């Protein structure tokens, strides 16, 4: 069986461990991703102009 | 009131079945000092000195 989440969610397995896989894949500190993942701050994409 | 007093008297850290082998084990269990308990310390959290 399975559950459709209707909203993307993060895997605590990879987000929260001392060598954070997603954190160093993004080349950005864990605190920024933790803050953006809990709606404390936004993150922008593209916006070259 | 009744729930709190019964919960303490029946199901608590320091209210245990009294041993009944001989009168000696009874009398020993009655006058016992336990360092554990609610406001006390846990087994794994005690060092050599205690």
């Amino acid at each position: 069986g399975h559950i459709e989440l209707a909203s993307p969610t993060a895997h605590i397995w990879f987000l929260k461990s001392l060598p954070s896989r997603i954190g160093l894949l993004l080349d950005m500190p864990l605190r920024d991703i933790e803050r953006v993942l809990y709606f404390e701050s936004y993150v922008v994409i593209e916006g070259g102009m | 009131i009744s729930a709190a007093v019964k919960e303490f008297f029946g199901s608590s850290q320091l209210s245990q079945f009294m041993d009944q082998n001989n009168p000696l084990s009874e009398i020993t269990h009655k006058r016992r000092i336990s360092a554990l308990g609610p406001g006390g310390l846990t087994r794994e959290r005690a060092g050599f000195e205690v």
């Binding site: - | 360092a35 308990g37 406001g39």
Partner: protein, 50 residues
């Protein structure tokens, strides 16, 4: 259990591996929250609530 009051401790002086002995005072109430006063090896007072 520990009688409520004031207790000074020395942590045996092996915390920062510099040989500097750190003294900490602690106020334990019968019911409430404790107070800690601790020393930073740079010789700075510090207070710890709860």
């Amino acid at each position: 259990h520990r009688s409520p009051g004031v207790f000074f401790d020395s942590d045996k002086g092996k915390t920062h591996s510099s040989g500097k002995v750190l003294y900490n005072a602690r106020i334990i109430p019968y019911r409430g929250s404790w107070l800690d006063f601790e020393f930073d090896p740079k010789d700075n007072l510090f207070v710890r609530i709860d």
